[model samples]
Target chain A: MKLSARNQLAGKVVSIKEGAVNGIVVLDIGGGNQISSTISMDSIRELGLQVGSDAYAVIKATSVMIGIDD
Target chain B: MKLSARNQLAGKVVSIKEGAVNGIVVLDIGGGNQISSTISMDSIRELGLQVGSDAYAVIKATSVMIGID
Candidate 1:
């Protein structure tokens, strides 16, 4: 899909946690780094996401909030 | 600094809103895209961030959660 966000990371499915409306999907992007995503449960089923499956995290630069602690 | 995130977009500061403890910083990354960041007010002063300043939104892939619907 075309996204306004410029950052797209390739990741492999690692874990899935489901709540009532939203579910969390964890992806292993290698180099010991993992990315987590909170998506709708319906989308999870629609995507047919499974362990060992491949997915991409599409992030909108605007959606990404930055913080600093000093 | 070094971040685990693979994507870093260059942006120029546009607006800053301060709260009790946290502040919101908006950056204009060109292409008609604007990024807003929520950072600590203390950090804001430490970083010397202001309008028209240049900064980067550092994100960790792990810190970044994704959703699909």
Candidate 2:
């Protein structure tokens, strides 16, 4: 699929933890590295996220923020 | 500072465009690769983001979503 964001990491769903407002989903990008995404609980349910499912961690550049070390 | 998000990309600020409510910021992660961030105009001003500044693209896993091909 076409996305405006440049960073797209492919991986499999490793875990999904639900909370009242949001859910935390983790993706195993292989090589022991994993990425986690926090989205609305509604989204998690809508996406039907489950462990072992293949998915891409989609990030929008607009949602990202730049921070300095100082 | 420490954040719960899993992805943290180190790069340099290449551009910042201000809008009415939000601002778009671009980061050069080298090797001809770049990442952009859409943040609140308040944040853009608070962080004093500008071209040629070193920063990290902090993303919360919550803000990230899973997409299928």
Candidate 3:
């Protein structure tokens, strides 16, 4: 992983969801909660995204999208 | 770092909170604010998360939940 001006945390790829064009990547950083990064198939392979692979997650103070799990 | 389908700017890993099952990894992007992602413990160690490590971060416009923080 490359360094950024903004600091982010490292997370593992828990699951990869495929869609018509794009899909959501679920990551579990051991936070009792799951964070999702919506991406496209092209990016998936480009990033070599796979289950149990290491990835970078940059979170902002207010960027935390708060929602309740149904 | 790998590019993203969504044009998410790059960021860094600040802190990591682990739990019995899951935890919250706090990433300080230094945007005068902090964003977050909910994840599980297995994903944490598997990702080899560390403090102040370089990683890729993907972000979108609407995907960003706007609120009065």
Candidate 4:
């Protein structure tokens, strides 16, 4: 998947954990770090999102969840 | 142009702000809201990113910047 300048981040779908209502999707961007996001099952099937699929997470830069410093 | 569930938010590029080393790109996803992100000049030109262009703000869901409103 190619990343455009405006994209928050681009990566590939690593795995998907099915849920009763919403599902957890994992994306690996190759920084040895993985991103986990939640999506509704309806959205999931509608988007045809699946493991090994190429997809974009479309997030704001600041939306990047930062860990709280203890 | 359109939003997919996997994508953090899909929107259209509204403007591009040139900078010395990097540039700020803005994407308005409707809902009377907007999202701004920074990018490198090289990446900008290479990606052929421009105003009125369709682009995805590819971000982790957790990355959705929440303002203290």
Question: Highest lDDT, which number?
Answer: 1
lDDT string for model 2 (B1-69, tens) is: 233334677899988887998878999988998888877777677677778988888766555689998
**Residue lDDT tens for model 4, A1-62:** 34542544557889988988788888896788788878777777887788887776665333
Clashing pairs in 1: A37-B66, A66-B37
Give the alpha carbon lDDT tens digit for every residue of B1-69 in model 1: 354457687899999998654679998888999888876566789999989999887766656678999
Using all chains and alpha carbons, the TM-scores for the candidates as numbered come to 0.47, 0.46, 0.44, 0.48
Candidate 1 ranges with C-alpha deviation above 4 Å: A67-70, B1-69
Which candidate leads the pack in DockQ? 4
Error of 2 at B4 (Å): 1.3
TM-score of chain B of each: 0.83, 0.81, 0.67, 0.74
User: Which regions of candidate 4 are displaced past 4 Å?
Assistant: A4-70, B1-5, B65-69
Could you tell me which 10 consecutive residues in candidate 1 chain A have the lowest summed lDDT? A61-70
Decoy 1 TM-score against native: 0.47
Query: DockQ (C-alpha) of model 4?
Result: 0.27
- On TM-score, who's better, 2 or 4? 4
lDDT of 3 by residue, A1-70 (tens): 4322133656898999898777888778666766788767777788888999988766543445578989
lDDT of each: 0.80, 0.75, 0.67, 0.71
The stretch of ten residues in a row with the least summed lDDT in candidate 3 chain B is: B1-10
True contacts kept of each: 0.00, 0.00, 0.47, 0.42
